[PDB]
């Protein structure tokens, strides 16, 4: 449950599925996370391509012709066409319904893990204001903001400056 | 003052998909698995053109009905029209017509 | 003078996708016929501009 504590999505973030918005002295902007986006797209295409490419069909001419005295095999033929129709229709509907659930879960899963990786590093230096956002106690410049994104953020070296504002 | 948020993409997309838990879910990006469009032509199958009999049916063509005096070395399938009436001009019974049909359908 | 790999009495179809709702009677290496009107597999995520 990360998509719809983070109510909405960003039409401002144009260059990825997942990412970040920041604000400091130097300025504010949306910044997409390519590596999580790249994987998501690479894995989801593999998913789409599995549903499609796996369908290796036999050469068939579905049509058949019978005379006025062969009504029974006619109806046997029709039973074959209609039984396969029913099987495929059902399966195709469900396959969609179920993989759609998982896709959307996956996307939720990734966001969650992104937000969790950030929260894990920052610990006490920032306040969880809800709405997916962290409000820093200390001053975090672009460089500092970068380290968090690529997960190399150094906790101790701001905490004393953050302890001042914590009280 | 200084903030950082985690978030996700949104766009102008109106595309709805269905899941097993929820119907009419609007998504950013989607594909279609269902082919719902056709070219409106009868094309060449495996590069090989069909045999189009026009106003004749197989009976008419094979016997040589006088209306059917207007064929390739091979064909991928045979095409008749719903109005195809010129078959056996002299009345009588065509023994194993349907079998000859299945047996002439690709050559 | 088009080429196809799947033929239907009212038209030819592209065999990109696994399923089709055009016609049950087909000739060739055809997509499996179904009675659905949409089969839309989500690639993106939930679109909520709040």
């Amino acid at each position, epitope marked *: 449950g990360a998509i719809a504590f983070i109510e909405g999505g960003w*039409t*401002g973030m*144009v*260059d*990825g*599925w997942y990412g970040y918005h920041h604000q400091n002295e130097q*300025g*504010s*902007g*949306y*910044a*997409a996370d390519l590596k999580s*986006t*790249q994987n998501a*797209i*690479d894995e*989801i*295409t593999n998913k789409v391509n599995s549903v499609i490419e796996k369908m290796n069909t036999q050469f068939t001419a579905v049509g058949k012709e019978f005379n006025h005295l062969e009504k029974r095999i006619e109806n046997l033929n029709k039973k074959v066409d209609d039984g396969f129709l029913d099987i495929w229709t059902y399966n195709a509907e469900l396959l969609v319904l179920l993989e759609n659930e998982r896709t959307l879960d996956y996307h939720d899963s990734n966001v969650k893990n992104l937000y969790e990786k950030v929260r894990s590093q920052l610990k006490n230096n920032a306040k969880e204001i809800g709405n997916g956002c962290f409000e820093f106690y200390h001053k975090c410049d672009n460089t500092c903001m970068e380290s968090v994104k690529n997960g190399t953020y150094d906790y101790p070296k701001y905490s004393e400056e953050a302890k001042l504002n914590r009280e | 003052s200084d903030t950082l948020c985690i978030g996700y*993409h949104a*766009n102008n997309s109106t595309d709805t998909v269905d899941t097993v838990l929820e119907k009419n879910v609007t998504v950013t*990006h989607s*594909v279609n698995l269902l082919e719902d469009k056709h070219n409106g032509k009868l094309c060449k199958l495996r590069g090989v053109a069909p045999l189009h009999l026009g106003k004749c049916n197989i009976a008419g063509w094979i016997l040589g009905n006088p209306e059917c005096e207007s064929t390739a070395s091979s064909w991928s399938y045979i095409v008749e029209t719903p109005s195809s009436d010129n078959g056996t001009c002299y009345p009588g019974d065509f023994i194993d017509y349907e079998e000859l049909r299945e047996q002439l359908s690709s050559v | 003078d088009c080429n196809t790999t799947c033929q239907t009495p009212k038209g030819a179809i592209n065999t990109s996708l696994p399923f089709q709702n055009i016609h049950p009677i087909t000739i060739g290496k055809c997509p499996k016929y179904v009675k659905s009107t949409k089969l839309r597999l989500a*690639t*993106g995520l939930r679109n909520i501009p709040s």
Partner: antibody
Amino acid sequence: QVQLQESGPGLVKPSETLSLTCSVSGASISSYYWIWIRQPAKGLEWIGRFYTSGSPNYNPSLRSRVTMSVDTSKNQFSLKLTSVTAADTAVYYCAREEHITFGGVIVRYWGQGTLVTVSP
Amino acid sequence: DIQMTQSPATLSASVGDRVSITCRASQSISSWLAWYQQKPGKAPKLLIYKASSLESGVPSRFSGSGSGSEFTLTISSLQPDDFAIYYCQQYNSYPWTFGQGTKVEIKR
């Protein structure tokens, strides 16, 4: 469809700055990433990318001499190339970087191209 | 930072021949590669994105294949309008880099 046109001096003497501008009709300039690409009369080379909101990214082989900006009042975007040389003589294109798709991000729409000569 | 090496550099084929242009990346780039067609005195147009996705509007005689480190543009049956220089381009990483191009002339 969305139009992009390049305008600029054509001829700009050595060691000087070069300015180009890209008018966009058919779409908002606030709502997209925009890129510049050149090629000498040689192959295509990607100059960089700018967005209103907003983090630029420039090609390291040039990053020190280049600057980009957007002008929302006139729906235009601009490229500045300080301290030009012989190498900088090229045909410059502006292009729209599309919103991420399942593709994901591609240059679909380009500008007509403008020629730039570095001569005294 | 990521070198794109294209081959061949020139190519002459007749109307109807199959043409193959090959692109190689110095490191793995998965399927983040596009193909452009640049006509003379024109902006290069997009033909194929994500290695093997045919641009809407583009003829199906064009096709793309490959992932990781090797990629291929095929024109199954060449037509006179196909005279142009063809470029491959990666978008795995910044900067985006393009190939040195391949000039394709028609042999009549």
